[PDB]
Motif scaffolding. Sequence first.
Motif, PDB file in Angstrom:
ATOM      1  N   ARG A 162       0.793  -1.235   0.000  1.00  0.00           N
ATOM      2  CA  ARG A 162       0.000   0.000   0.000  1.00  0.00           C
ATOM      3  C   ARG A 162       0.834   1.299   0.000  1.00  0.00           C
ATOM      4  NH1 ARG A 162      -4.293  -3.639   3.394  1.00  0.00           N
ATOM      5  NH2 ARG A 162      -6.049  -3.364   1.939  1.00  0.00           N
ATOM      6  N   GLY A 163       2.126   1.190  -0.291  1.00  0.00           N
ATOM      7  CA  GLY A 163       3.009   2.353  -0.335  1.00  0.00           C
ATOM      8  C   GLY A 163       3.639   2.597   1.023  1.00  0.00           C
ATOM      9  N   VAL A 164       4.553   3.558   1.077  1.00  0.00           N
ATOM     10  CA  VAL A 164       5.435   3.729   2.226  1.00  0.00           C
ATOM     11  C   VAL A 164       4.904   4.689   3.305  1.00  0.00           C
ATOM     12  CG1 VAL A 164       6.791   5.726   1.417  1.00  0.00           C
ATOM     13  CG2 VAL A 164       7.919   3.862   2.723  1.00  0.00           C
ATOM     14  N   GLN A 165       3.739   5.290   3.085  1.00  0.00           N
ATOM     15  CA  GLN A 165       3.300   6.380   3.961  1.00  0.00           C
ATOM     16  C   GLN A 165       3.090   5.959   5.412  1.00  0.00           C
ATOM     17  OE1 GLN A 165       0.157   7.736   1.114  1.00  0.00           O
ATOM     18  NE2 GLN A 165       0.861   9.760   1.831  1.00  0.00           N
ATOM     19  N   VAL A 166       2.536   4.767   5.629  1.00  0.00           N
ATOM     20  CA  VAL A 166       2.337   4.266   6.992  1.00  0.00           C
ATOM     21  C   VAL A 166       3.688   4.049   7.699  1.00  0.00           C
ATOM     22  CG1 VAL A 166       1.623   2.226   8.318  1.00  0.00           C
ATOM     23  CG2 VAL A 166      -0.003   3.337   6.791  1.00  0.00           C
ATOM     24  N   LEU A 167       4.620   3.352   7.049  1.00  0.00           N
ATOM     25  CA  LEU A 167       5.951   3.154   7.644  1.00  0.00           C
ATOM     26  C   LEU A 167       6.646   4.492   7.860  1.00  0.00           C
ATOM     27  CD1 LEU A 167       8.091   1.301   8.796  1.00  0.00           C
ATOM     28  CD2 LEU A 167       8.907   0.843   6.482  1.00  0.00           C
ATOM     29  N   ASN A 168       6.519   5.405   6.901  1.00  0.00           N
ATOM     30  CA  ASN A 168       7.112   6.730   7.055  1.00  0.00           C
ATOM     31  C   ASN A 168       6.584   7.452   8.304  1.00  0.00           C
ATOM     32  OD1 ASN A 168       8.793   8.979   5.966  1.00  0.00           O
ATOM     33  ND2 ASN A 168       6.792  10.022   5.877  1.00  0.00           N
ATOM     34  N   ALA A 169       5.281   7.347   8.529  1.00  0.00           N
ATOM     35  CA  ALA A 169       4.653   7.927   9.721  1.00  0.00           C
ATOM     36  C   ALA A 169       5.146   7.249  11.005  1.00  0.00           C
ATOM     37  CB  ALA A 169       3.147   7.840   9.623  1.00  0.00           C
ATOM     38  N   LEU A 170       5.304   5.931  10.957  1.00  0.00           N
ATOM     39  CA  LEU A 170       5.812   5.187  12.105  1.00  0.00           C
ATOM     40  C   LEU A 170       7.213   5.644  12.466  1.00  0.00           C
ATOM     41  CD1 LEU A 170       4.395   1.626  11.387  1.00  0.00           C
ATOM     42  CD2 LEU A 170       4.027   2.937  13.505  1.00  0.00           C
ATOM     43  N   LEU A 171       8.092   5.718  11.471  1.00  0.00           N
ATOM     44  CA  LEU A 171       9.497   5.998  11.742  1.00  0.00           C
ATOM     45  C   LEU A 171       9.742   7.454  12.139  1.00  0.00           C
ATOM     46  CD1 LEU A 171      11.439   3.787   9.182  1.00  0.00           C
ATOM     47  CD2 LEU A 171      10.324   3.158  11.337  1.00  0.00           C
ATOM     48  N   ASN A 172       8.809   8.339  11.796  1.00  0.00           N
ATOM     49  CA  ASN A 172       8.897   9.764  12.138  1.00  0.00           C
ATOM     50  C   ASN A 172       8.037  10.149  13.354  1.00  0.00           C
ATOM     51  OD1 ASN A 172      10.627  11.318  10.059  1.00  0.00           O
ATOM     52  ND2 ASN A 172       9.457   9.878   8.801  1.00  0.00           N
ATOM     53  N   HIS A 173       7.389   9.158  13.969  1.00  0.00           N
ATOM     54  CA  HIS A 173       6.520   9.378  15.134  1.00  0.00           C
ATOM     55  C   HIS A 173       7.295  10.011  16.300  1.00  0.00           C
ATOM     56  CE1 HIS A 173       3.699   8.439  18.427  1.00  0.00           C
ATOM     57  NE2 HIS A 173       2.790   8.336  17.476  1.00  0.00           N
ATOM     58  N   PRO A 174       6.662  10.898  17.079  1.00  0.00           N
ATOM     59  CA  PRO A 174       7.353  11.525  18.208  1.00  0.00           C
ATOM     60  C   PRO A 174       7.819  10.577  19.317  1.00  0.00           C
ATOM     61  CG  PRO A 174       5.008  12.045  18.242  1.00  0.00           C
ATOM     62  CD  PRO A 174       5.294  11.427  16.914  1.00  0.00           C
ATOM     63  N   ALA A 175       7.338   9.333  19.320  1.00  0.00           N
ATOM     64  CA  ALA A 175       7.771   8.352  20.310  1.00  0.00           C
ATOM     65  C   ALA A 175       9.291   8.187  20.349  1.00  0.00           C
ATOM     66  CB  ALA A 175       7.123   7.013  20.057  1.00  0.00           C
ATOM     67  N   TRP A 176       9.941   8.301  19.195  1.00  0.00           N
ATOM     68  CA  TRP A 176      11.370   7.949  19.096  1.00  0.00           C
ATOM     69  C   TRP A 176      12.312   9.094  19.465  1.00  0.00           C
ATOM     70  CZ3 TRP A 176       9.398   3.728  19.535  1.00  0.00           C
ATOM     71  CH2 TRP A 176       8.413   3.233  18.678  1.00  0.00           C
ATOM     72  N   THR A 177      11.766  10.288  19.697  1.00  0.00           N
ATOM     73  CA  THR A 177      12.552  11.425  20.187  1.00  0.00           C
ATOM     74  C   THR A 177      11.985  12.028  21.471  1.00  0.00           C
ATOM     75  OG1 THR A 177      11.310  12.857  18.661  1.00  0.00           O
ATOM     76  CG2 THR A 177      13.382  12.062  17.887  1.00  0.00           C
ATOM     77  N   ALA A 178      11.043  11.336  22.103  1.00  0.00           N
ATOM     78  CA  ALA A 178      10.403  11.828  23.315  1.00  0.00           C
ATOM     79  C   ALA A 178      11.364  11.714  24.493  1.00  0.00           C
ATOM     80  CB  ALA A 178       9.128  11.040  23.589  1.00  0.00           C
TER      81      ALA A 178
END
Length: 236
Positions: free
Chosen positions: A220-236
Amino acid sequence: PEFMVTPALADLQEQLYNGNEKSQLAAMSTLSTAGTEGYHLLQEFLKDSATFSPPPAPWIRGQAYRLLFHSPEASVQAFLQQHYPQGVIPLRSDRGVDYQELAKLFVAEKFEAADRLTTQKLCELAGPLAQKRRWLYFTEVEQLPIPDLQTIDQLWLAFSLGRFGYSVQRQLWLGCGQNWDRLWEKIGWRQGKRWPRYPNEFIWDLSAPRGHLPLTNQLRGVQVLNALLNHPAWTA
């Protein structure tokens, strides 16, 4: 005193507590072959190491717990039932989501099932419509709660010797120049000129490349994974 007594296992004990990650993992592996005393040392390590700060890599306690979980000793299983009935990784949610079963699959190395449940849990978090749909819009991903995503990712890390998790995929992606084509090769999501067939062509154990799991469907394209990897969880 940092820890209690125990001679052949004296250096292993010190290494378990004070070694670098490679040394700790090697030490606990050896200790799990050293019978009642080896397992007792691992129990004490779970108790004692909870005081360590800043937070060490979650797969040190994760793997120690797994080794104890797999022990034949009745006393070890009693210890785990008494003190770690829902595992060793804190299960946190902003939406009352239950991660107990997910944690159980992980310690048992049931990675295919854990990956199925991961996806189901993301859909649960996004609400009834996503839950019924069984997949996510990227806008829904952007809105997932930080605590939930951290719980999911911490579980993936803790039970994969740090090889798996969204945070791993993020770091690999950033180290691949944010180039998706390079990422797919890096994490083993290509079968020549096509995507691998789910589930049979993925690798459901720790021989898999770093970042191989969890899966996010690229049909379905990369947009979901892109959103996951850029989520604020990983820099919180």
